[PDB]
Design a protein around this nucleic acid. Structure first.
Ligand SMILES: Nc1ccn([C@H]2C[C@H](O)[C@@H](COP(=O)(O)OP(=O)(O)OP(=O)(O)O)O2)c(=O)n1
Ligand SMILES: [Mg+2]
Ligand SMILES: [Mn+2]
Length: 580
DNA sequence: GGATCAGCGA
DNA sequence: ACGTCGCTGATCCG
């Protein structure tokens, strides 16, 4: 039923009040330099709809905006903030974000628009976004009066949902988690995205050059070794032209056939010199398309920068997400892939990249929550549990543990505390089930207080229906009561990982809050560029490095006081690769 | 277009 | 039965 609003053809005084619901509509999925299709304003004085072309020229409207004393209630404020940034317009004053509010109250709700968020509060006087602009090869902006009626309903929806959403947060002890943590971070992530990272494009290209070379040269050998013309990309083909054309053993099977995962071609290599050229050719493939081109595809022409979008209310545990491109999955494990980081450089001349980590954080975080005597005492002794477990998964001595090695021991360590079964472990470090099984018993012999944790957090979820993080981020687990054994089991493994994965994500979020607050009150040219789950990557002039090497680690270790010490590793250099 | 698959990261 | 949490490129298939 037509909600009455005045389609404004000019701005006015009564629509620039010190509190209003705002909507700077960015239909485009990727808001980087995306046009603004419309504006809407609800405030005690009424409901208005301003046309972008208009309002974004009006200095009185542009002022009310950039004015932090003029309050704005919104949904996905970063989406608008970044879009405006690219227009030279500053957006301050956002005191409430409906999107992040619904995320804290229940990340499983999967809110992708105001309607979905509103529905969560028995408010449905608003249409879902997909209904208004559609999707697929049809997607478009409805005509003036349709776009208008919707933007005003979304704004009106935001106007009314603030109270309901804030109260439940208040009762859930998440009001501060919203206002003092999630909302502050949204402005910082906007800067990081708008700032973007510089891309050594010339190099990156001269990389794709040779790749194609070492590709076909490893593609024909494949047709040779196989003796035909199958496409290395069809697992169905890799299955037949393998175990059924080329007769090899099946050590594992998929829900369609038999695994051709790398953890198989590996074990099934010596049975033919084709399984080796497939391992290498697939690596060069991935690294070729999913990166060289994949990155250059998002590199803007002028600034030569890429601008990731840090999705803040997407993951179910509190972690951030990155897309177009995913800068949280840049190669680093092997040497070939790692060099691509030499393509990531400082944004200004004579600057440096400063990357800071967090030493075995989830393990430290588990130590604090689980409170196992020996896991804490160990850290209080400053040991590297990854290297140690490596000393076993290889029986070697501390001095004989390699970077490559510490990785598997690391994956084993988390595999073990987060559910892993003797079979899962057995296939990982490629051993027997009886060995893996006993290695896990001794693990919990080393950390009994932790065993007790895997057992009570399962009961905790079973009783409350939700797990929680250090900073009060909660995760509902209704499948914990499932009568299906595997639904219940996945639920239980979530109750074991979410509190830990989530608390670690809360801490890197708070550290980020202290880091911007510090860099600002000390006024430095340095700023954050990326967040990689438990690592921050800043860029600054060479002259600030000496102050960074102390301020960046100190801020991160201070964020929260655990029963164990936090510890940061940090390095810097001319490129992302150099920063080590 | 979607459903698996592949491979990369934390 | 199944460690957790993500994103992107490639090809099978109506
Ligand atoms: N196989 C993995 C790898 C990582 N993580 C989680 C736990 C780690 O603590 C966190 C950060 O990833 P890192 O690679 O930084 O691992 P740590 O931080 O634990 O090790 P490092 O001492 O190298 O920082 O991500 C996990 O659950 N399972
Ligand atoms: Mg890391
Ligand atoms: Mn780390």
């Amino acid at each position: 039923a037509k909600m009455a609003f005045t389609l404004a053809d000019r701005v006015t005084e009564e629509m620039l009040a010190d509190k209003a619901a705002l909507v700077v509509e960015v239909v485009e999925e990727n808001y980087h330099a995306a046009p603004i299709v419309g504006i809407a304003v609800v405030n005690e004085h009424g409901r208005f709809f301003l046309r972008p072309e208009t309002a974004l020229a009006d200095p009185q409207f542009v002022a009310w905006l950039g004015d932090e004393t003029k309050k704005k209630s919104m949904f996905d404020s970063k989406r608008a903030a970044v879009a405006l940034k690219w227009k030279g317009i500053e957006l301050c004053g956002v005191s409430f974000d409906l999107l992040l509010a619904a995320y804290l109250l229940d990340p499983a709700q999967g809110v992708d628009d105001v309607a979905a968020a509103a529905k969560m509060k028995q408010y449905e006087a608003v249409r879902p976004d997909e209904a208004v602009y559609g999707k697929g090869a049809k997607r478009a902006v409805p005509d003036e009066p349709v776009l208008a009626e919707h933007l005003v309903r979304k704004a009106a929806a935001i106007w009314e949902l603030e109270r309901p959403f804030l109260d439940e947060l208040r009762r859930n002890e998440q009001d501060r988690l919203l206002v003092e943590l999630e909302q502050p971070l949204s402005s910082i992530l906007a800067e990081m995205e708008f700032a973007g990272v510089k891309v050594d494009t010339k190099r990156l290209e001269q990389m794709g050059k040779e790749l194609a070379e070492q590709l076909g040269t490893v593609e024909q050998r494949i047709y040779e070794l196989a003796g035909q013309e199958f496409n290395i990309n069809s697992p169905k083909q890799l299955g037949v032209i393998l175990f059924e054309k080329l007769q090899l053993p099946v050590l594992k099977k998929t829900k369609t056939g038999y695994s051709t995962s790398a953890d198989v071609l590996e074990k099934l290599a010596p049975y033919h010199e084709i399984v080796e050229n497939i391992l290498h050719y697939r690596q060069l493939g991935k690294l070729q398309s999913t990166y060289i081109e994949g990155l250059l595809k998002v590199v803007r022409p002028d600034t030569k920068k890429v601008h990731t979008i840090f999705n803040q209310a997407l993951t179910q545990t509190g972690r951030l997400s990155s897309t177009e491109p995913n800068l949280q999955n840049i190669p680093i494990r092997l040497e070939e892939g790692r060099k691509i980081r030499q393509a990531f450089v400082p944004s200004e001349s004579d600057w440096l990249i400063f990357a800071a980590d967090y030493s075995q954080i989830e393990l430290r975080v588990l130590a604090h929550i689980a409170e196992d005597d020996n896991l804490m005492e160990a850290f209080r002794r400053d040991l590297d549990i990854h290297t140690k477990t490596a000393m076993d998964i290889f029986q070697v001595s501390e001095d004989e543990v390699t970077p490559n090695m510490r990785r598997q021991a690391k994956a084993v360590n988390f595999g073990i505390v987060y559910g892993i079964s003797d079979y899962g472990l057995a296939q990982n470090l490629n051993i027997s089930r009886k060995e893996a099984a006993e290695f896990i018993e001794r693990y919990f012999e080393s950390f009994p207080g932790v065993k007790r944790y895997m057992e009570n957090i399962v009961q905790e979820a079973k009783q409350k229906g939700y797990v929680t993080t250090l900073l009060h981020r909660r995760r509902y687990l209704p499948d914990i009561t499932s009568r299906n054994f595997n639904v219940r089991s996945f639920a239980e493994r979530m109750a074991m990982n979410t509190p830990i994965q989530g608390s670690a994500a809360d801490i890197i979020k708070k550290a980020m809050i202290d880091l911007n607050a510090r860099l600002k009150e000390e006024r430095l040219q340095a700023h954050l560029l990326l967040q990689v789950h438990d690592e921050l990557i800043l860029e600054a002039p060479k002259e600030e490095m000496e102050r960074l090497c102390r301020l960046v680690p100190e801020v991160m270790e201070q964020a929260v006081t655990l029963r164990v010490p936090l510890k940061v590793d940090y390095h810097y250099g001319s490129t992302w690769y150099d920063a080590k």
